[PDB]
Every structure is written in structure tokens, then in C-alpha cells.
Design a protein around this ligand. Structure first.
Ligand SMILES: [Mg+2]
Ligand SMILES: [Mg+2]
Lengths: 196, 196
């Protein structure tokens, strides 16, 4: 079961943190009334208008970005696992130094050994298994007793290639059933799953 | 009128070109049926599910990107203006070298003098007016007889700061009426407007 896994690895972006965007600039650009939610308002527009506005939003994702925040339930999950004495790692395309800064910013830096935060320079790009194998070696543990937690297909492919169990979070359903051992809408539901 | 303007400046990203994304990966990740359009399907989902899936899409905009393509009507507009003997420029945050490559790829490199394609190293970031003032100087023309064409607020602010007329394209309405002299849903409608 999930609770028997005592070695956990997380993707960073999209899993533990998510990008936040400039709501006021979006509302202004897309002519959203103050009384309306942005997405709800867009879904209710005529199809062609909704499509043009959604396209503009995606096109300007980086222009509109304002750093990142912890994903729902992420801090709570990591603290729960750390409280158990579990061993926790990170596998990210980010430079280790940025990953470190991010961990400090969200108050989780003390839950991961610095050597177990693997960035751009410490491991090949997902879905290559190198990074998970590096942690498996450092921890001297069977990959079958580790879990890779992510929100994107290359996270699941990476776990499957290395032989770890896999978890999908931050999508509401199960789009890759063969690649995914457990799925949860977010880290808060994952914590609940773990508990049960 | 618009047709009296013989000096035109364009933003690049979002105006002449737009990012394209991996439709098959999106469909797989978001569980979209083959018979459905991605956006139409998402708008029809329960609110919470639609929101989670739209959030994931925005979060992975760069992961899903597959270069860029010309924006609707952009090639046709630029060729029409060049055919008139009009003077055309680019003001972009992109490195000039990338802008050049992009122009070559979309078959428009011959419509702009190389010196009039202004990139990262040739002009300060929008909305600073430096870049438009640089073109105005090179062309020896009143900014009031130039137009800046863009799809984002900093393009309009840049034109207003330099004193050029401004055009909004690639949004379907008029969100910044005081900043915008003419607006069109895209470059094809702008060409039509120009003609009329
Ligand atoms: Mg990710
Ligand atoms: Mg732009």
C-alpha cells in the first residue's frame, strides 16, 4: 500500500508549486466584470470570443506570470511525510539553486536533504530514469519501494523507467491509467489517501 | 485615416506569430474525446473539473509548446503593406537574431530592412518608447504618422509614450479604448479595415 512507501520523490513545478498570474491584468485584457470569475465568465461567452480570449491567455502565460506559490495541500503533505521520518527527494529540470530558493520560500527546505534535491546539473532530463536511480542508490532502496509524484506525463514515464511506483496529482481524473499507480486531485487528497 | 500611415511597426510574438502547442498531448492529458474540440469540451465540463484542466494547461504552456506559426492574416497584411512601398519595422523583446530566423521561417524577411528589426539589444523593453523613437529617427518621420501594432498592453503603452498611433490585434474587442486608435480581431481584419 501507499503508506508502506517510506521514500518519496516529487517533481517541483506543477507538483509542489504552481505558477501564479496577474489576475488584474487578465481581467482588464479580457474585459471580465469584477463580479465574475475569469474562467466562468470565459466559458459563458460565445464560442469564438471564448476561444480567442483563451488563446491570448495561453499565448501570454509568461508575460502574466508572477512567480509561484505552493500547490494546494503540498506543504501539508510534505510536512506529514517528514513528520513520519520518511526520506524525501526532488527531481526537477530547475537548477538546484533555484529549487533551493523555492523550497526556502515555501517553508519546506528542512524536509529534504540538500543532496537529495536533484536539479538540472545532477540528473538527466525526465523521462530518463537517471535521477530516480541516483536517489535509489543514495538511499540504497529498491525502486519498487519508492514513489515518484508528479503532474505531467514525463514524471510518470520517469518513474516507470526507473521502476518506482508513481502518483499523479493536480489533475482531477486518471488519464494515464497504465502509468499511474495512485492518482489524486491534489496533494491534500493524496495525504487523505495515504491516511486511509 | 489608417491608409495614410506609411510607416508601420509590429510586435513579433502574439502579433505576427503565435505559439503553437501539442494538441495530441493536451488531448491525452485532459481526456478529450477525438470527436470533441479541446476548448469546447472543457467549457462543457463541470466547473471544478474545467478549472483544474484549464489551470494545468496554463501551467504547462511551455512544456506543450512546439514553436510558433504566423498569426491569422499576418503574412497577408505584411505583404500588402510591403507591396504598397510602405516602411515596416519590428520592435520585440526577442534577440534580433531570433527575430530574423523567425521572419525567414514565415517568409517575410524581405519585407523589413534588417536595421529596422529591433530586438533585445537594439532598444529598451516596452513600454519604454526608445525603440519606436529609434525607428522614427531612422525614418525621419513624425511619430504621429507611424503606427505600432500589437496584442498586449505594453505595445499600446509604448506607442502612446512615443507618440505613434496604435492598433490592437488578436483580441476580439476593445479593452483599452483610450490606448487604442484602431482595433481588429486579427491582421486579416486589419487589412480589411485598411482597405475600406
Ligand atoms: Mg511538472
Ligand atoms: Mg506580444
Amino acid at each position: 500500500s501507499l503508506s508502506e512507501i517510506k521514500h518519496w520523490v516529487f517533481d517541483m513545478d506543477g507538483t509542489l508549486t504552481i505558477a501564479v498570474h496577474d489576475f488584474a491584468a487578465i481581467r482588464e485584457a479580457l474585459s471580465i466584470p469584477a463580479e465574475d470569475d475569469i474562467l466562468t465568465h470565459l466559458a459563458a461567452l460565445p464560442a469564438d470570443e471564448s476561444a480567442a480570449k483563451h488563446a491570448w491567455l495561453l499565448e501570454h502565460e509568461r508575460d502574466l506570470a508572477q512567480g509561484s506559490r505552493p500547490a494546494p495541500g503540498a506543504v501539508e503533505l510534505v510536512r506529514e511525510l517528514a513528520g513520519r521520518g520518511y526520506r524525501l527527494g526532488i527531481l526537477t529540470r530547475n537548477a538546484r539553486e533555484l529549487a533551493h530558493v523555492t523550497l526556502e520560500a515555501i517553508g519546506l527546505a528542512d524536509c529534504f536533504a540538500e543532496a537529495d534535491v536533484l536539479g538540472r546539473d545532477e540528473a538527466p532530463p525526465k523521462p530518463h530514469p537517471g535521477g530516480l536511480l541516483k536517489l535509489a542508490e543514495a538511499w540504497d532502496v529498491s525502486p519498487s519501494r519508492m514513489v515518484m509524484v508528479g503532474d505531467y506525463r514525463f514524471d510518470l514515464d520517469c518513474g516507470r523507467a526507473a521502476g518506482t511506483r508513481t502518483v499523479l496529482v493536480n489533475l482531477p481524473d486518471n488519464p494515464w491509467p497504465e502509468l499511474t499507480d495512485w492518482h489524486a486531485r491534489d496533494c491534500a487528497q493524496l495525504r487523505d489517501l495515504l491516511s486511509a
